[PDB]
Ligand binder design. Structure first.
Ligand SMILES: CC(C)CCC[C@@H](C)[C@H]1CC[C@H]2[C@@H]3CC=C4C[C@@H](O)CC[C@]4(C)[C@H]3CC[C@]12C
Ligand SMILES: CC(C)CCC[C@@H](C)[C@H]1CC[C@H]2[C@@H]3CC=C4C[C@@H](O)CC[C@]4(C)[C@H]3CC[C@]12C
Ligand SMILES: CC(C)CCC[C@@H](C)[C@H]1CC[C@H]2[C@@H]3CC=C4C[C@@H](O)CC[C@]4(C)[C@H]3CC[C@]12C
Ligand SMILES: CC(C)CCC[C@@H](C)[C@H]1CC[C@H]2[C@@H]3CC=C4C[C@@H](O)CC[C@]4(C)[C@H]3CC[C@]12C
Ligand SMILES: CCCCCCCC/C=C\CCCCCCCC(=O)OC[C@H](O)CO
Ligand SMILES: CCCCCCCC/C=C\CCCCCCCC(=O)OC[C@H](O)CO
Ligand SMILES: CCCCCCCC/C=C\CCCCCCCC(=O)OC[C@H](O)CO
Ligand SMILES: CCCCCCCC/C=C\CCCCCCCC(=O)OC[C@H](O)CO
Ligand SMILES: CCCCCCCC/C=C\CCCCCCCC(=O)OC[C@H](O)CO
Ligand SMILES: CCCCCCCC/C=C\CCCCCCCC(=O)OC[C@H](O)CO
Ligand SMILES: CCCCCCCC/C=C\CCCCCCCC(=O)OC[C@H](O)CO
Ligand SMILES: CCCCCCCC/C=C/CCCCCCCC(=O)O
Ligand SMILES: CCCCCCCC/C=C/CCCCCCCC(=O)O
Ligand SMILES: CCCCCCCC/C=C\CCCCCCCC(=O)O
Ligand SMILES: CCCCCCCC/C=C\CCCCCCCC(=O)O
Ligand SMILES: CCCCCCCC/C=C\CCCCCCCC(=O)O
Ligand SMILES: CCCCCCCC/C=C\CCCCCCCC(=O)O
Ligand SMILES: CCCCCCCC/C=C\CCCCCCCC(=O)O
Ligand SMILES: CCCCCCCC/C=C\CCCCCCCC(=O)O
Ligand SMILES: CCCCCCCC/C=C\CCCCCCCC(=O)O
Ligand SMILES: CCCCCCCC/C=C\CCCCCCCC(=O)O
Ligand SMILES: CCCCCCCC/C=C\CCCCCCCC(=O)O
Ligand SMILES: CCCCCCCC/C=C\CCCCCCCC(=O)O
Ligand SMILES: CCCCCCCC/C=C\CCCCCCCC(=O)O
Ligand SMILES: CCCCCCCC/C=C\CCCCCCCC(=O)O
Ligand SMILES: CCCCCCCC/C=C\CCCCCCCC(=O)O
Ligand SMILES: CCCCCCCC/C=C\CCCCCCCC(=O)O
Ligand SMILES: Cn1c(=O)c2c(ncn2C)n(C)c1=O
Ligand code: NA
Length: 389
């Protein structure tokens, strides 16, 4: 069958992907620019990620359409056309890893997050990562290429000029670069690092949430021991334990919460002094006042701390879905390259499967705006306003 028929389907799908990638991620950038509630360090890497996806539609997809034709070109010009998408993929990887690290810092050390993770430092990290992406992705242009050994018979059959080659990806980009350097070192290792970071984030969240519940139970259990205690020493043992737990849990709403813990510790000290004097009944009656503080203050702190953690678990899952989708989207093309490289006795993957793998990789530049709309309310609402207005 004529090559332009099969090409037409591939080309049309590529253009449709390019349009969607541009529109969706331009909307992401426009939402962050307009909504100050979306202007945080986490969303600065989201914008950098969206910028890479906009460049996929504007440049990488037209480059992929061009290189599918095998047109005659100077080999190093062809290399740029072949490698630029690797720059964008590398940048995306850096942004995805930065988002994962950012969410770990926020959940593991929230008391020092604002002082450690700032917008100015984030912009500096984004700039460095872009420079690194260019270096990694354009490494073939540094000499790790096949331009020294051009397919002369293919170039002559296509009427290429002297010094030109038929511009095809696998003719100019070495497969040992694609598999060992790009896939294994620069894609697989960072993705396994993100998985590691995500596991730590979820484990930290779970651990925190049994700590909140453990403290709620413990306060309640120690109130029961005091009620059915029969001597002053037992009341003292329970109160002593309580006081330590109250200070451990203390480490508009913040003013009433600090006042709630000032009442709690003070009421524990009142009953402790009565227990040390041997006045058991008085100590017990004083410890009963703690239930008033628990209902009006402590329980509200427990449902708000728990609520905050849930929101973090939710936000970490949304970010992990984005990283997972990147892996799902790019792995097929990388796995095919592994078969091409590691099995010279296997027939090369057919052209239609190469096209399918390539389009799948490009579809990843479309999916992120939909994940933000379906999982993050502040993005969703902002998208509605932009579209309406
Ligand atoms: C700012 C943005 C829009 C600029 C985009 C510039 C792009 C399209 C330019 C920059 C470098 C250019 C390449 C430089 C070298 C060659 C070799 C030549 O034998 C065929 C064209 C080809 C492959 C060019 C294609 C167009 C090209 C890729
Ligand atoms: C931000 C501005 C400066 C754009 C920078 C891009 C320019 C400087 C780069 C990008 C790609 C480069 C080209 C890539 C490959 C080739 C083919 C080679 O046979 C001659 C040089 C030539 C044609 C390069 C010239 C310089 C070039 C056009
Ligand atoms: C990451 C998830 C989606 C798994 C993706 C699995 C895909 C990429 C795997 C599964 C089966 C694989 C194919 C199995 C057998 C062959 C025949 C060989 O002569 C060329 C490669 C080729 C055609 C493989 C290409 C890659 C392949 C299609
Ligand atoms: C954590 C996971 C996603 C790591 C990625 C797994 C990759 C690296 C694995 C999965 C399946 C593997 C392929 C399975 C079968 C063959 C055929 C053999 O003749 C050469 C190696 C080759 C081509 C393997 C190369 C590596 C491979 C592509
Ligand atoms: C060439 C690439 C263009 C796309 C990059 C576009 C990036 C511009 C988006 C600006 C943005 O979203 O930033 C919000 C604001 O800067 C927070 O203070
Ligand atoms: C051929 C084209 C080559 C272009 C390649 C790189 C260009 C632009 C991407 C960078 C845009 C990423 C924007 C990130 C958001 C940001 O910078 O916001 C930080 C905020 O200002 C903190 O105060
Ligand atoms: C911001 C908007 C961005 C603008 C994006 C524009 C969209 C055009 C898409 C692809 C270009 C590919 C052009 C095709 C190049 C091949 C020409 C050629 O020579 O191929 C014939 C070959 O010789 C036979 O073997
Ligand atoms: C507007 C986008 C039009 C993009 C035009 C792309 C040119 C298609 C082309 O040149 O055909 C493919 C090649 O000839 C077969 O291998
Ligand atoms: C904002 C900037 C937007 C402007 C971008 C221009 C649009 C498309 C470029 C596609 C290149 C067209 C390829 C034509 C090459 C050609 O004529 O073919 C050579 C022939 O095969 C040998 O004799
Ligand atoms: C604002 C962003 C705007 C960016 C638009 C870029 C679109 C397509 C790239 C086309 C790649 C180069 C096309 C090659 C055609 C060509 O050079 O053919 C002549 C022949 O191959 C020499 O012998
Ligand atoms: C985790 C990545 C590890 C995957 C490593 C797969 C290597 C495949 C391989 O080495 O197969 C070559 C075989 O010797 C050809 O004769
Ligand atoms: C594939 C090539 C990889 C490149 C390896 C060497 C590059 C090392 C770069 C490190 C970035 C460190 C950040 C330092 C910022 C200082 C900027 C300044 O001078 O003010
Ligand atoms: C959701 C499941 C995927 C749906 C569509 C995927 C279709 C492509 C799947 C390909 C698996 C194997 C492809 C076989 C290629 C022929 C092997 C050869 O001749 O070398
Ligand atoms: C849908 C996007 C429209 C693109 C139409 C151009 C046809 C592709 C081709 O020329 O092979
Ligand atoms: C991909 C789908 C997202 C596109 C939905 C239309 C909104 C785009 C408008 C805009 O550019 O801001
Ligand atoms: C193709 C290039 C795609 C990039 C588009 C990104 C759009 C997002 C932010 C750009 C900043 C907005 C500039 C004018 C703002 C006017 C205003 O604030 O009302
Ligand atoms: C900027 C918008 C793009 C403008 C025009 C699109 C037309 C591109 C023509 C491709 C030429 C293909 C060829 O001659 O083989
Ligand atoms: C490696 C390439 C280095 C590029 C320097 C770009 C700007 C870096 C300075 C900002 C550092 C920061 O604030 O974290
Ligand atoms: C390698 C040679 C140079 C490659 C690209 C140079 C720098 C690229 C992008 C600038 C950084 C992106 C903007 C950061 C937001 C502030
Ligand atoms: C920075 C990383 C890559 C930039 C390389 C520029 C390529 C110039 C090639 C010139 C030539 O080979 O004729
Ligand atoms: C800082 C690093 C920037 C590297 C600068 C220039 C590299 C581009 C020129 C390479 C041309 C030769 C490539 C080759 O050997 O095939
Ligand atoms: C992280 C994933 C990379 C880990 C190991 C790379 C495997 C070593 C390469 C295979 C042996 C070389 C060969 O094919 O003979
Ligand atoms: C091939 C490596 C796959 C890892 C993908 C990286 C994103 C992590 C996603 C989910 C981990 C959370 C449980
Ligand atoms: C290889 C990765 C495969 C699938 C990733 C899809 C979504 C994973 C995110 C987990 C959410 C917790
Ligand atoms: C989800 C992934 C994107 C969905 C679009 C899948 C459909 C077509 C992708 C291109 C396949 C090329 C068609 C036949 C090419 C050929 O026969 O050579
Ligand atoms: C040929 C497919 C063209 C575009 C592919 C996009 C498919 C998935 C994208 C967004 C999720 C839909 C909601
Ligand atoms: C390839 C992408 C497949 C599935 C996820 C895309 C649509 C997201 C909606 C939530
Ligand atoms: C990343 N990538 C491509 O972008 C590509 C390709 N073949 C054609 N293109 C465009 N291969 C094998 C590839 O690994
Ligand atoms: Na991306």
């Amino acid at each position: 069958a004529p090559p332009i028929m099969g090409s037409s389907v591939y080309i049309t799908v590529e253009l449709a992907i390019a349009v969607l990638a541009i529109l969706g991620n331009v909307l992401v950038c426009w939402a962050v620019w307009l909504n100050s509630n979306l202007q945080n360090v986490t969303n600065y890497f989201v914008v950098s990620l969206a910028a890479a996806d906009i460049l996929v539609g504007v440049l990488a997809i037209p480059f992929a359409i061009t290189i599918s034709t095998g047109f005659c070109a100077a080999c190093h010009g062809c290399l740029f056309i072949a490698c630029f998408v690797l720059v964008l993929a590398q940048s995306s990887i850096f942004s995805l890893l930065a988002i994962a690290i950012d969410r770990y810092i926020a959940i593991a050390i929230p008391l020092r997050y604002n002082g450690l993770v700032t917008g100015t430092r984030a912009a500096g990290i984004i700039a460095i990562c872009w420079v690194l992406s260019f270096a990694i992705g354009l490494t073939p242009m540094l000499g790790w290429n096949n331009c020294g050994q051009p397919k002369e018979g293919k170039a002559h059959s296509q009427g290429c000029g002297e010094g030109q080659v038929a511009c095809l990806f696998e003719d100019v980009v070495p497969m040992n670069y694609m598999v060992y350097f790009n896939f294994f070192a620069c894609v697989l290792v960072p993705l396994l690092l993100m998985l590691g970071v995500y596991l730590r984030i979820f484990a930290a969240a779970r651990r925190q949430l049994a700590d909140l519940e453990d403290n709620w139970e413990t306060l309640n259990d120690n109130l029961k021991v005091i009620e059915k205690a029969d001597n002053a020493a037992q009341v003292k043992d329970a109160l002593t334990k309580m006081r330590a737990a109250a200070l451990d849990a203390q480490k508009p709403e913040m003013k009433d919460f600090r006042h709630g813990f000032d009442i709690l510790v003070g009421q524990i000290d009142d009953a402790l002094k009565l227990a040390n004097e041997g006045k058991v009944k008085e100590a017990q009656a004083a410890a009963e006042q703690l239930k008033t503080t628990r209902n009006a203050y402590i329980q509200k702190y427990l449902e708000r701390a728990r609520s905050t953690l849930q929101k973090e678990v939710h936000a970490a899952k949304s970010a992990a879905i984005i990283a997972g989708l990147f892996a799902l989207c790019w792995l097929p093309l990388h796995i095919i390259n592994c078969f091409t490289f590691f099995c010279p006795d296997c027939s090369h993957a057919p052209l239609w499967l190469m096209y399918l793998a390539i389009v799948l990789a490009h579809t990843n530049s479309v999916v992120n705006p939909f994940i933000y709309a379906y999982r993050i309310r502040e993005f969703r609402q902002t998208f509605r306003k932009i579209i309406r207005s």
